[PDB]
Amino acid sequence: ATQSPGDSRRLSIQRAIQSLVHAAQCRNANCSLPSCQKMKRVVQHTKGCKRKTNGGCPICKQLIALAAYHAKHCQENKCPVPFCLNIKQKGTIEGRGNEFLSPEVFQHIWDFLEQPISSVQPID
């Protein structure tokens, strides 16, 4: 067509989700992963994101895309991702939430996770 659907986006997204999902459910002494320990820092961002009540930070605003992308395939009793857990309890539209897209900035979050040299200074 003029534009193709986001099917291959899965190969790009699932790579970022392997770390996110695992780190969300990483609450155990037996849990020992490399990417996990790094991901924990990103989890602290939403943990203290008071800005959500004012709008939301770039990380938070961006992560929602992935929460919903995982929710179509994560439909369980106690979903690992804390954001998708809310999607399940609100799965009443099954359209608006699911249908989400973000620009190349989506990749920038995973870059600073390892190289904190930007402070994601929000702008207009």
Task: State the nearest-atom distance from the C-beta of 95 to Zn ion, in Å.
Answer: 18
Site pattern 42..81 for Zn ion (x: CB under 5 A): -------x-x-----x--x-------------x----x-x
Residue partners of 53: CB distance under 8 A and separation at least 6: none
What does DSSP assign to residue 69?
Answer: H
Measured distance CA(49)–CA(74) in Å, rounded:
24
User: Pick from 13, 36, 65, 113: which binds Zn ion (CB under 5 A)?
Assistant: 36
- Closer CB to Zn ion, 9 or 73, in the complex: 73
Task: State the nearest-atom distance from the C-beta of 18 to Zn ion, in Å.
Answer: 11
Do 57 and 51 form a contact (C-beta atoms < 8 A)?
yes
Residue partners of 113: CB distance under 8 A and separation at least 6: 38, 39, 41, 42
Stretch near Zn ion under the rule CB under 5 A, chosen from 5-13, 31-39, 90-98, 106-114: 31-39
Closest CA to 62 of 94, 19, 24, 108: 108
- Closer CB to Zn ion, 1 or 118, in the complex: 118
**What does the binding site for Zn ion look like in residue numbers (CB under 5 A)?**
26, 31, 33, 36, 49, 51, 57, 60, 74, 79, 81, 84
